[PDB]
Amino acid sequence: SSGSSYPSLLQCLKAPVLSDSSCKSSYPGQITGNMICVGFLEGGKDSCQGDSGGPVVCNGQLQGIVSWGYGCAQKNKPGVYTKVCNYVNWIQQTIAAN
C-alpha cells in the first residue's frame, strides 16, 4: 500500500550512467568505489524516497541499486547507486551457501 505520498503505479525513468569524476565532483568526500552516479546534472529527473533497493538496469543487466542522494532531482546532485558490478561474487556465493 502506498500510504500518504507514494504513487500507486510503478514509475519508470531512462537515465545515463555518469562519469566517476562527475559523481565525485557532485558529492565531494562522499563517493566510494562501491557507488555510481546515474541521472542528470541539470536535475529534474531522479529516483527518490521509496525507491531505495530498486533496480538500475542497463542493456538487460542490473548495474545499480537505488541508495541515496541529496534531495531528489536537484541540480548537480544526481542519484547515487550501489555499484552491482562490484558484488557478483558476494551475491553468487551468498546465494550458493544459503
Binding site: 500500500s1 507514494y6 542490473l62 557478483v88
Partner: protein, 125 residues
Amino acid sequence: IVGGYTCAANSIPYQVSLNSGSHFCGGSLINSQWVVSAAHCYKSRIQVRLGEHNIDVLEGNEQFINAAKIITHPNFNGNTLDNDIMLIKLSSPATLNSRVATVSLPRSCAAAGTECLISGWGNTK
C-alpha cells in the same frame, strides 16, 4: 521516481515491492528464491510482493511471500551507506511467469553514458 513516466503494467517483471504493512522499499528478483535490495532497507520482517503494478489494488498477478532470511552486506556502513546491498530469501520460491521474472547480473561494469532504466514506487515530487 521524479520526472519519470508510468511503466506499462508488469513490463518490469523483476521489480518487487518490500512491504511491512505498507510499501517502504524496492528490490529486484535475481532467481526464484532471492531478491537483491539495499541494506538500509533492512527490517526484521519483510513481505516481498511480486507481480505488482498498482500496489493498492489487487489485480490478479500478485504473489505475496514473506522473507525467510535477510542478509545485509557485512561491511555495510550505516553512516555513509557504503556497501549498501542486501539479499532476501523468499520463504517459498516465487512462481516465474510472464509478469514475475528475473534480471541478469552484470557481466562487466557499465560505461559512462550508458542509458539505463530505473523504476520504483518512490516519491514523484
